[PDB]
Amino acid sequence: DIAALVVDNGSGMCKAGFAGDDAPRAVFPSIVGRPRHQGVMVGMGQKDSYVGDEAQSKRGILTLKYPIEHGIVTNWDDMEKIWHHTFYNELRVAPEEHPVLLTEAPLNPKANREKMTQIMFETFNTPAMYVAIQAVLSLYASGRTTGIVMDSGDGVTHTVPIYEGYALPHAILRLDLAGRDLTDYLMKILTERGYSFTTTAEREIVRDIKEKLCYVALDFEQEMATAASSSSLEKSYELPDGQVITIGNERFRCPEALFQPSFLGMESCGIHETTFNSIMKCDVDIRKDLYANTVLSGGTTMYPGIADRMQKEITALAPSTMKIKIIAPPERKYSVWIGGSILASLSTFQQMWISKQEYDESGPSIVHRKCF
Amino acid sequence: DIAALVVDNGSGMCKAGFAGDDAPRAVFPSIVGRPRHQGVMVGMGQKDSYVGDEAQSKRGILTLKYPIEHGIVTNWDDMEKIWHHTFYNELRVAPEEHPVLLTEAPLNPKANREKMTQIMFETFNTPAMYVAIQAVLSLYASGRTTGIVMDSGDGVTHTVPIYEGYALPHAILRLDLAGRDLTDYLMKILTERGYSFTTTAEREIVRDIKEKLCYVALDFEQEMATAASSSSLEKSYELPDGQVITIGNERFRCPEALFQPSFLGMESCGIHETTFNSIMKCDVDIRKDLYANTVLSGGTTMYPGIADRMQKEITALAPSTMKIKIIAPPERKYSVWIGGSILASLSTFQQMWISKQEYDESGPSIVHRKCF
C-alpha cells in the first residue's frame, strides 16, 4: 500500500516523486520568493513568501534566493518551506505515512545531513528515511554496476567511481564549479555585447538563455576563429520585454568555463582533468572497465556537443590502448532521481531505512553510521 | 680558503649552509611560484617566477609548484631555479669555487642522481661534489655509528638500519606516506566541519594548521571517545584573513594516518610496522642493538606524542626481552643537515669528492660507483 517518497533535493532545482516510477512526479526550482516592495491593494493575495512555481512567474516583484548554495543548505528556515511545499502542495501527501529518501552531495559538511535528518523527524514526523549519495544513484539508473559517474548539477560537480556497486570513497572528486557558476560567468561576459543583467529576477532570464543557446565547442580556438572570421553563429533571443538581443561568440565561451576554470578566477582544473585524475586514483585492475563506462549525468552535462568534447579530451589524456566511452543517456537530467527510485524499490533496501525508534537511541548522529 | 657547502634540498624545504657550523645558514620552502594573473601596473618590477620564501610571501597571486614530488624530481627546470636561488640569494657565494654535498633519499631512480650530478657540474660549475644518503647522515648527527634511523621528510619516508656506519642496503624500507599526504588528508577531513581549503595557496594554511595544532595520541580509540564525549580537545586557529576556525577530533585523526595508512587510502603498513620490519629484515645478532638505538628524524616526526606512541607500538610488536628506546633528538628537523656538516668537515672525507676532472674522464655514471 504505502510507497516511499524520493525527493532529489538537488541545489537550484528540486525534484520529487513516489518510489517505483520511471519519472519524477514534480520538478520545481528551489527558489524562495519574497516581496521587496510594499503592497497597496491589501486583501488581493498578500502572502509573506512564494515558493516554487509561484516564485518563478511572480519574479518581477520578488527577491529570489536558493536554500541550497554549492550543495550546502545555507538557510534552514527556507529549506523547511521548500520541503513543506514539496510535501503538502506538489504531491499533496502527508509525510507521516511514507519513507523519505533524501540525497546529498559528497564531501558536504558534517552538520548538513545531521540537520537534514533532524528536520525530517522532529518537524515532519516521517516514519523512515535515508540519506543517499547523489552520484551513486546515477550509475544505478544507467543500468550498470561499474564505471565513474560525472554528476554536474546546479550547485556541485563531482566525479565518483563505483565498481561492482561498491563506491570508492578515496577517489571521490568534488568541484565547486557548477551550472550557477556558468550563469554568473554569462552575466559577466554578456556585458561586452552591451547587455546588463544584475538582478535576481534577471538571473533567471540569464539561466534560460544559457540552457537554450549556449553549447560546448569541440575545438575552442577553431570556433573562436570561426566566429571572428564570419558572423554565422549569432542567435536572436527575446526577453520578456520583447527586446531582441543577439549573442554570437558568447555561445561557447560560457560552457567552456567547465573545462578551464581559470575563466572564473578559479585555480582547479577542468571537468575532463577532474575525471581523469579521479579515474587514475582508482585501483589499476578496475581501470580497464572504468574508461568504458564513463557516464555523464545531471543537468549541466546536457550541453550540445559535450559528449564529443569529453571523449576527445579524456582520450587525449588517457593512453591510446584504453577504450574511452562517454556514455550520455538522453534523459540524464533526472538520472539521480531514477536511481534513487530504483534503490528505494528494492526489498533489500527495506532494511536500510533509519527508523524513528533508532533515531531516538543515538540522536541525529545516527545518520553518520547507517548511510555510506 | 674555501669551505664546503651542504645542501639538503629534500621535498618541501631546502636547507643549505656552510660545512662546519651547527645550524643551516638558509632554510626556505622549496617551491616555485608563477603569477596566476597578468599585471596591469608597470614601473614597479615584474618577475615571471618567484622562488623560495618570496613565493610563500606572495602566495595569494601565485600558482605554487613543488619541484620534487615524493622524493623524485619532477620538473628539473625549477630545481635549477631552486639551486640558483640557494647559491646566489641565500648563501650569497658563487658555486664555482665551493665543493658541495647533496643528499638523496634511498631507492630513488638512478636517473635522478645522474641528472643531479650532471646539472651540478655543467650548469653551476662546482669544482667537485658528493651525494650521500639522506638518512645515513641523520645517524651521524646523533653520533651513533649504529642504530635504525626513521626519516620522515615532508613528502617521503624511509627507515634505514645502519651498523658501524655501513648502512644495510637490504633492510632500507621505503614509504611514500609523509607530511604532504598528511596535509592532503587534513584538508579532506577538515572538509567534515565545513572548512574547504582547496587552492594551492590554502594548502600552506592547512599545512601550518597541521604543523601547529596536530598531535599523535597514545591510544586512538580512547582519545576518540574523549573527543566525542566532551569539548576539551577543541583548539582554535586564526587564518591569515582574520577568520577563526575550530578543530576538535581532527587534531589527532590527521597524524594517526602515519600508523594506519588505511585512513588515507594506502595499502602499505604503518610507520611502526615499517620500523619493525626494518629491524626484523636484518640479522638476529644486531636486531637488539637496533631496538635500543632507534633514532627519529625529519620534520614529520616533530608531532607531540609520537615518541611514546612509537615506543608503545614497537614494544608491542617486538618481543618482551628486547629493551625499546626511541631516541628523539630535540632538533630532528635539521638532523640530516647537521650530520652533513660533520661528514664534510672530516679530514678523511676530502679524498672522496667527485672532481670535475674525474667527471669528464668518466661521465656522469661515475656517481653510481663512487657514492654508496
Partner: peptide, 7 residues
C-alpha cells in the same frame, strides 16, 4: 561554506 567560498 563557512570558510572559503560563500555557501
Amino acid at each position: 561554506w563557512x570558510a572559503x567560498c560563500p555557501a
